Amino acid sequence: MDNIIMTAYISIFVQIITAIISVYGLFIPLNFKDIILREILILELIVQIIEFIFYIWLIITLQSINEDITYVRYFDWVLTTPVMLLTTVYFFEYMNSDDGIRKKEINDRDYVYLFYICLSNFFMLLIGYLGETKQINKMLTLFGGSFFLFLTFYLLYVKYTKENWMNYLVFGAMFLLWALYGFAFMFPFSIKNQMYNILDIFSKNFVSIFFFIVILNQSYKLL
């Protein structure tokens, strides 16, 4: 319980730093080819805002924790994870494109496929939620949740990697990170919530820093 609070504080600290860096990133000048990076960073900021709200709620709630509140993370995940899957698509397309493609042209063209990526993800979270609130056994949760995790990442792979080895490396790192959310689900209250507190730093905040550094690097090249 003390370690859940401690890791929450560490997570909130990293979130504050990353939020400030991200706001700064919005003002960095980019060539026409690179503007989609700012479009991505704005969506990451929106993810950060929802994450920050949950973590403020968490640190207040923990002060008087009289129940397993793990399930409340899903109110965050249900909103943030679909946005994070879209930013991944946008980045893959940015890497695959010669002319400065923007998210609007990707959305207009692929909205149906994007919907199916997010629908697969939703079913993963729904099954996970049923498991976390103990409406179904852990083994059925892992099985169902794992299937939709695999379905989501397969859909992302076959459409958007386009034999780009940079896309492959980002894909493998992201898949492993998301999979560890599945492994965390197997642990008791305290360990599981410490894991989620720190995994969120990697999946959300460190990913924001990556986009910030790429923006900085592309801005320097420009000038």
Ligand X SMILES: *C/C=C(C)/C=C/C=C(C)/C=C/C1=C(C)CCCC1(C)C
Ligand Y SMILES: CCCCCCCCCCCCCCCCCCCC
Structure tokens at 16: 């504050």
CA distance 160 to 156: 6
- Does residue 40 contact residue 211 with C-beta atoms inside 8 Å? yes
Q: Report if residue 146 touches ligand X, rule: CB under 6 A.
A: yes
- Indicate the residue among 43 and 214 with the shorter CB distance to ligand Y: 43
Give the alpha-carbon dihedral of 30, 19, 73, 6, to 10 degrees: 140
Residue 72 near which of ligand X, ligand Y, none (CB within 5-8 Å, type-dependent) = ligand Y
Q: Report if residue 50 touches ligand Y, rule: CB under 6 A.
A: yes
Residue 44 near which of ligand Y, ligand X, none (CB within 5-8 Å, type-dependent) = none
Q: Report if residue 141 touches ligand X, rule: CB under 6 A.
A: yes
**Residue selected from 6, 16, 26, 53 as contacting ligand Y according to rule CB under 6 A:** 53
The residue number whose beta carbon is nearest to ligand Y equals 54
Q: Report if residue 203 touches ligand X, rule: CB under 6 A.
A: yes
**Residue selected from 10, 30, 43, 72 as contacting ligand Y according to rule CB under 6 A:** 72
41-80 residues labelled b (16+ CB within 10 A) or e (exposed):
bebbbebbebbbebbeebeeeeeeeeeeebeebbebbebb
Q: Work out how close the CB of 39 gets to ligand X at its nearest, in angstroms, rounded to a whole number.
A: 20
Selected range binding ligand Y among 49-57, 84-92, 126-134, 196-204, rule: CB under 6 A? 49-57
Task: Identify the H or E element spanning 58.
Answer: helix 36-62
CA distance 18 to 7: 16
Q: Work out how close the CB of 60 gets to ligand Y at its nearest, in angstroms, rounded to a whole number.
A: 10
